[PDB]
Symmetry: D2
Subunit: 247 residues, 4 copies
């Protein structure tokens, strides 16, 4: 019977919408959450009400043996994995390491490493059932806290370089690797949103479903020949420095 | 009633499949051909047998006033253009300029210029009906002849740079610009194909429909937030130098 | 004598670039954001090298003040031959309210500042047959200080703006390149009480012999502005000992 | 004395790079594909500079012969400090039959050759504490000659292979960069009966003062291998006066 999809950081936000969409396409879903059993089980229930089996597993970026154990559970629950959505667009916070204080590159390095570690672990299981697909997604939401707590997101360059690297490592195992970078958009909640609305060309505010569509495309059998590509989905917001200058 | 799509180089190969797919999605189609009225009108007839109106117009890369005239015809036939498939993956040949003999960059320069000239002309018409979409496609098929006759294709770098440039110029007119580069694959016909088959990982030979899918994705309303992106569709063939080395 | 402007040049990489260019025989414009004395000290050290020097105050997000500084260079030296467009200074700027929502907005404001300065410089350089612009950038110390952020730009944004400038300005005989060389992560240039414990942490995580220093970013800037580099256009060089891809090397 | 290998060095850019490195005090290995005499003449000119020289014959698509050349360098000089991995020589190679089907296959064979040489060089450099590798490339004269093609690689392929090498070899103290500088389009280096009419055509289509020459690619190679560039890793520099984006400048 059904194919299996793991989505990390999927008790809410983009992870949830991605796991929902995939449940609607008939995958059995693995929901992964870092603290917040509540949202996670709510989300599992929703999923379950479409037919489709669900498994809920807890683990966060800073937990290597818990991550391996999570894949060991997937194997014992479903015995296969087809689609892995390696989500660093979740806005989940992780403690700042002293290192990172010295340079932004160290954050990117730690976060790219986490993306790579997860994708490789996933690959050991996928290659039992003849491979499958990995799509890494990422957004650099905010910097609310820095007292510990920074993003798990990577920049587009690090994402590009990491996903080019994975496609060459994993194409020989029948794992199709791509990525999507962008990310949609505390107090003043409304005021920060109106600030962001007036600074964006009309009609060009990215939403969660926009990132979800692309992942869905990449994971359908209409994209099996796209390898190691990183697609920016953001309505052009990362190059707005050029539109305004070029007029 | 219907939306309108122009596909250049569409009397055969990838152009044809792209114009077919779009006819199946309910666009009125403009077929453009360079010499070979036969294939073109055959192709128009096929199109017409799906409902959907067709217009056949002749013009080639080396003909500026004929190209403008072609858009002046579209305007007088349909009075609007929504989707433009700026096709440099057609394998149509153009005469070599003496310039090009001196360096590959001059070929790329001439061909990128042609892509840009067409896209800008198209943009003047599209902006009458509130914009639309442009997808530039390209492949560097062979070098059969060089006695005149070279490709109209561009490299991925020139395609990237040209499509980044167009998205910033045209996003302010509601024209969504992206690109796809790759291209599927005379005597020994069979032997060159078996050579290409044994040198490609099994299951990873790109076909025309693979480029057609991506264009179709980019042109659906599921991609309106993808701007100025160039997607490589080739099963990883352009980075096979790395798979073989990295083992 | 030729003339060189270097923004954020009272301290750090901009200081060291102004010294190297003064050593090559340019008159120098020192731009400072914050402390007069540092800028006055640097001005005096470069004067000891036998070039004239001009100190002007201006910070990003002061477009009127920026415009006047270039009017001052024209008033004082009447020319501009090299512009080191410095976003690698570690200077902090006030956070704009939108930019709380997404990293992209910070990158957009920072890139727009580099663009605007280079364009202002270019109007001036027109009058003496053009020159060289090099934008340099580091995303160093995104430490903490609610309401303060980096003026730095990321590689991708630096690359795209440098491509753009070179295409816009080569026709005006202005050679445009950039150094992202993520910049100097070493360096007592970093005001953390633990200053020392952090350097040794940076040192213990980076392969031996591979810690970039200010002088490496400066050596590239100097090569880009020497006669030996005139056919390089619109390039962005990362100078960081591979730090930004250490992840791939760990992986292998 | 240190030692430098430059492939395709009998003529053109490889010749000029061997001369510059001999002028900096390296012993030189001249590799030639085709003509003994050119290589013998170049060897004699570099000898006049007071360094020792070794001439070895080898062409791409001869992997056994390539391996032996590095064994010869070890036999003659016992070390290797700088490898100029030259795909900008304009040397032609026999077309493989698959590569008729798509440009990508030519780029794959050309990139694989650069990779294989640099890896062979690296085994040797291990024994003297590593060194510098710079790959250079030009897609010049893709003229005509049924059954013959360029050994050159495109920017994107050069960039991806250089990224790869730097990640693989930095851990071995081998600094890897590349110059694509699309190379020299000028140049009596180009054997067309109309030689002259073609240069003036190249000249009339490129902005004034913006025609790259061999010495510009050589100046970058020399900067990349000097002490001043050790923190630059895995970078690919285009040196072409903007030629590869002239399309954007026309457009504007």
């Amino acid at each position: 019977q059904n194919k299996c999809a793991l989505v990390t950081g999927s008790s809410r936000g983009v992870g949830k919408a991605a796991a929902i969409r995939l449940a609607e396409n008939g995958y059995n879903i693995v929901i992964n959450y870092a603290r917040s059993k509540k949202a996670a089980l709510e989300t599992a229930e929703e999923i379950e009400k479409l037919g489709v089996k669900v498994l809920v597993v807890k683990a966060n970026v800073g937990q290597p043996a818990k991550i391996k154990e999570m894949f060991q559970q997937i194997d014992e629950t479903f015995g296969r994995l087809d689609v892995f959505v390696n989500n660093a667009a979740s806005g989940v916070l992780r403690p700042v390491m002293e290192l990172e204080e010295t340079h932004w590159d160290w954050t990117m390095n730690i976060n790219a490493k986490a993306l790579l570690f997860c994708a490789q672990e996933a690959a050991k299981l996928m290659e039992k059932n003849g491979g499958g697909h990995i799509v890494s997604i990422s957004s650099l939401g905010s910097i609310r806290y820095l007292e510990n707590y920074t993003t798990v997101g990577v920049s587009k360059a690090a994402l590009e370089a990491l996903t080019r690297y994975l496609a060459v490592e994993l194409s020989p195992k029948q794992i199709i690797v791509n990525a999507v970078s962008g990310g949609a958009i505390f107090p003043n909640r409304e005021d920060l949103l109106e600030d962001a609305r007036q600074n964006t060309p009309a009609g060009r505010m990215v939403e969660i479903k926009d990132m979800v569509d692309t992942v869905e495309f990449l994971v359908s059998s209409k994209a099996d020949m796209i390898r190691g590509q990183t697609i920016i989905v953001d309505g052009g917001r990362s190059l707005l420095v050029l539109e305004h200058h070029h007029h």
